Write a protein that binds this ligand. Structure first.
Ligand SMILES: Cc1cc2nc3c(=O)[nH]c(=O)nc-3n(C[C@H](O)[C@H](O)[C@H](O)COP(=O)(O)O)c2cc1C
Ligand SMILES: Cc1cc2nc3c(=O)[nH]c(=O)nc-3n(C[C@H](O)[C@H](O)[C@H](O)COP(=O)(O)O)c2cc1C
Ligand SMILES: [Cl-]
Ligand SMILES: [Cl-]
Ligand SMILES: [Cl-]
Ligand SMILES: [Cl-]
Ligand SMILES: [Fe+3]
Ligand SMILES: [Fe+3]
Ligand SMILES: [Fe+3]
Ligand SMILES: [Fe+3]
Ligand SMILES: [O]
Ligand SMILES: [O]
Lengths: 399, 399
C-alpha cells in the first residue's frame, strides 16, 4: 500500500500489461491502474475495489493491510468490472459488510455479481456517513458520468474527493501522485480518455462540477479510480474538463479515410496540401483508418474544428471501417464541428453521398463533398488541392 | 516462364508475401499470384500484365522471354491494378502496340494510367482476333464479373479460356497447375475468394456461364489471372461456381459478435449449446469480430443457412465493428439466409433492435431477437440456451 494522505491508504493495482479496454474499443498504450482506497479512522472504509482479473491479488493485498473483518463500510462509486470486479471475492469473506452506493448501483452490482442478498445502502447527493475523528463521507451522485450508477465520495477534514472514473486516465506508473509522473504523457492520457469515453456526456460535466463547487468544500486532493492522485494543484484537471466539455476545438483539421487502391489517399494528401498552403495556423493530421490507432484518430477529431472523411465506393456502399467509425462518432456526439466527405469511385459511385448524410446525422455541419473517378490525374489533383484551399478558407478562425 | 500448353507461356508473378488486398478488406493468408500469358503463334499476344508493385520485374522478365517489339497485340481482360498495373511501364517501351479490351476497359485503363493516346481496340462478345496457324482469340464480355470492364478471352485450337479473376483464387505456389497443388488449400482459397468478392454478383454468374457453354466450344484448360491453371478436369471449378452462385448454403449457422465486458459472449456460447443439443446436423461456428479474421467470418456466413449477430449497446448505438460488418454485408448481398440479433445492455439499450433492422435491410430473414441485461445469471443463460434451441428448430432442414 501507499499512504495517500493521513489515514488514507492506496490499496489498488497497477496494470502495466493491459492494452485493450471495452473489448478493443479503447487501446491503453501506456497501460492503466485501478485505484482503491482504505480510510482508517474510527470506522474503516474501503472505497471501490479493482479489476476482476486481479480479484485474488486484491483480497490478498487487502488482508496484508488490514484484517478484512475490521472493514466497517464498503463504498462502491461505480460498478463497472474494472472497479467492482473484486467485490464477489471480497464479499465472500465478509458477506455481512454494508455496501454504500447509488440506487442505480444496486441494479448494476447485482447485474454483474448476482448477490442481491448483500446489504446495500442507497445514498443520494448530500447524504453522509460518519467515520469518527471529526470526519465524514459526503456522497455526490453523478449519473451518466459515465454510467447511471456513478457517484463520487468526498472525505471531510482531509478534503479528498474520490471521483472514480472522472478526472482519471489510463496511465500506469509506480508513482501515485501527479507531480511525480511525466507531465506530457499524463496530459496525453487524460485527453485521450476524455475524447474517447466522456465526449458524449459533456453536457453533464459543467453542471455537475458547478454543483460540487457550490458546496463550498475544500479540495486538497482528487483521488480518481485510474492513474494519478491529483495532489499538486488538483483543480488543473477540473479546469481542463471544463474546457474539454465546452464543445472543445483547436485550430486543427483531421483527415481520415480508407482506400482499396490508394485513390482516396491521393485525394487526402492533395486536400492537406491545399489546407496547409492556405492557412498555416491549422494543424493538419491525416490517417488511413485501416493502418492507424482508432483512438488517436478520435482524439484528433475531438481536438479539431473540422474533419474530412474519405471512402471509395465498395459494392455500392462505403468501406466498412469508415461505416464503423461513423457509427461510433454518432454515439460520441461531437458538437460544433464541420465536415466534408470525399472519395473516389469507379462507375456509379454513391459512397461519398452516403457518408456525407451519415456525418450530418452524427451532428457535423457539412461543407460540399469532393468526388473523383478512378485515380486522380494532374488536373484532378489540382481540384483536390483547391478543395483543401476552399475548405481552409471556409473554416478559417478569426484573425 | 512456364509452358502452359503448346505456344502458351506463363509470364506472370508469384507473390508469397502479400497479405492485404483491397486495402485490408481481403486478407490473403496464403499469398497470391498474378497470371499473365504470352501466346506465340504467327502473331504474338500478351494477355494481361501483373500487379503494379512488380512492374519493373514484369517488363524485365518479359524481355527475357521475347523482344518487346515482337509483341503484336496486348489483351487487357480487366484493368484493376493487380493485372493492368505494369501496363504503363510496358507501353512506355512499345507505345504503338494495339490494346484489345472492352469499351468499359478504355475508361478504367485511362482512369488508372492516363494515357488515352494508346491504341485501344474495342471488342464485343463474339469478336475475334486471328493469330495464325488456324487459331484465333474470341472475346466474351463479362460486365460486373467483377468490374464493368471485365471480359474473358478464348483461344481456339488450344481450347484455353483466359478467365481473368473468374475461377481464380489467392493461393501462391511454384506449381502452375491445379493437379500439382494441395487440394484442400486450393478449395479453401477458391471458396474464400468467391464468398468475399463475388457473392454480390452471383446473379450474373449462371447466365454468363450458360452463355459461354452455349458457344459449344471445347474447354481443355481454364487459365485464370490468380493462382492455378485448371488443366485437370477444368469444369470442376465451373460447377463449383454454379453451386456457389445459387444462393449457396450448407446446414451451418455462424454466430458472431463484439463485446465490451463478455456479456454478449456468454449469450453467444449459450445459444450455440442450445443449437448443438437440438440439431446435431448443424455445423456451428462462433467468432468475436474484434479477435477474428473478418474474411473467415464472411466465408462462414456464405456457407451458412442462418446467422446470429451480437452487440451490446455502446453510447446508444451498436459496437462499431458490428456496424462495419453489417455495412459490408449489405454490399455483399447474401441471399436466402436467416438471422437473429442478440446482445446485452446496461440500461435503455437499443443496439439489438438497431442491428436487427439493418440485418433485415441487408436481406436477412429475421427471427426474434434475444436481449439480456448486464451479465446473464443462471436463469438468463437458460433463456439464451432456449433461444438457441428455438432457432435450431425453426431453421432445421427437412429430415
Ligand atoms: C471490391 C471493389 C468493389 C467496388 N465497388 C464499386 C461500386 O460499387 N461502385 C463504383 O462506382 N466503384 C466500385 N469500385 C471501384 C472503386 O470505387 C474505384 O476503384 C475507386 O477509384 C477506388 O478508390 P480507392 O483506391 O480510394 O479505394 C469497386 C472496387 C473494388 C475493388
Ligand atoms: C462505453 C460504454 C457505453 C455504454 N453505453 C450504453 C448505452 O448507451 N445504453 C445501455 O443500455 N448500456 C450501455 N452500456 C452498458 C453495456 O451495454 C452493458 O455493460 C452490457 O451488459 C455490456 O455487454 P457486453 O459485455 O457484451 O459488451 C455501455 C457500456 C460501456 C462500457
Ligand atoms: Cl490519442
Ligand atoms: Cl461517389
Ligand atoms: Cl475463409
Ligand atoms: Cl437492447
Ligand atoms: Fe467506468
Ligand atoms: Fe474505470
Ligand atoms: Fe479484379
Ligand atoms: Fe484480380
Ligand atoms: O470504470
Ligand atoms: O483484379
Amino acid at each position: 500500500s501507499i499512504v495517500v494522505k493521513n489515514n488514507i491508504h492506496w490499496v489498488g493495482q497497477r496494470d502495466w500489461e493491459v492494452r485493450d479496454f471495452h473489448g478493443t474499443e479503447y487501446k491503453t498504450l501506456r497501460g492503466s491502474s485501478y485505484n482503491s482506497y482504505l480510510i482508517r479512522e474510527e470506522k474503516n472504509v474501503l472505497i471501490d475495489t479493482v479489476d476482476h482479473k486481479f480479484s485474488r491479488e486484491f483480497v490478498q493485498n487487502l488482508r496484508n493491510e488490514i484484517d478484512l473483518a475490521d472493514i466497517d463500510y464498503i463504498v462502491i462509486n461505480h460498478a463497472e468490472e474494472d472497479h467492482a470486479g473484486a467485490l464477489t471475492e471480497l464479499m465472500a469473506q465478509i458477506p455481512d459488510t454494508p455496501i454504500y452506493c447509488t440506487a442505480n448501483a444496486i441494479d448494476s452490482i447485482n447485474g454483474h455479481h448476482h448477490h442481491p442478498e448483500w446489504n446495500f445502502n442507497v445514498v443520494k447527493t448530500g447524504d453522509t456517513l460518519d467515520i469518527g475523528n471529526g470526519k465524514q463521507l459526503i456522497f455526490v451522485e453523478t449519473p451518466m458520468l459515465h454510467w447511471p450508477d456513478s457517484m463520487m465520495t468526498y472525505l471531510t477534514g482531509d478534503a479528498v474527493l474520490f471521483s472514480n472514473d472522472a478526472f482519471g486516465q489510463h496511465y500506469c506508473d509506480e508513482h501515485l501522485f501527479n507531480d511525480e509522473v511525466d507531465q506530457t504523457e499524463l496530459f496525453e492520457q487524460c485527453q485521450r480518455y476524455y475524447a474517447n469515453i466522456l465526449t458524449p456526456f459533456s453536457r453533464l460535466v459543467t453542471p455537475k462540477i458547478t454543483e460540487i463547487l457550490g458546496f463550498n468544500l475544500p479540495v486538497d486532493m482528487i483521488a480518481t479510480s485510474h492513474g494519478v492522485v491529483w495532489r499538486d494543484n488538483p483543480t488543473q484537471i477540473v479546469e481542463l474538463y471544463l474546457k474539454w466539455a465546452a464543445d472543445y476545438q483547436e485550430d486543427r483539421i483531421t483527415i481520415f479515410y480508407d482506400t482499396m487502391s490508394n485513390n482516396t489517399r491521393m485525394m487526402a494528401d492533395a486536400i492537406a496540401q491545399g489546407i496547409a498552403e492556405t492557412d498555416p495556423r491549422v494543424a493538419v493530421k491525416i490517417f488511413n483508418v485501416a493502418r492507424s490507432d482508432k483512438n488517436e484518430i478520435l482524439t484528433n477529431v475531438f481536438r479539431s474544428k473540422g474533419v474530412l472523411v474519405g471512402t471509395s465506393t465498395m459494392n455500392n456502399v462505403m468501406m466498412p471501417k469508415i461505416a464503423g467509425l461513423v457509427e461510433e462518432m454518432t454515439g460520441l456526439r461531437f458538437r460544433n464541428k464541420r465536415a466534408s466527405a470525399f472519395g473516389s469511385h469507379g462507375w456509379s459511385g454513391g459512397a461519398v453521398d452516403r457518408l456525407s448524410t451519415r456525418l450530418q446525422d452524427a451532428g457535423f455541419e457539412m461543407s460540399l463533398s469532393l468526388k473523383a473517378k478512378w485515380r486522380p490525374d494532374q488536373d484532378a489533383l489540382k481540384l483536390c488541392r483547391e478543395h483543401g484551399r476552399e475548405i481552409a478558407r471556409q473554416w478559417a478562425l478569426a484573425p
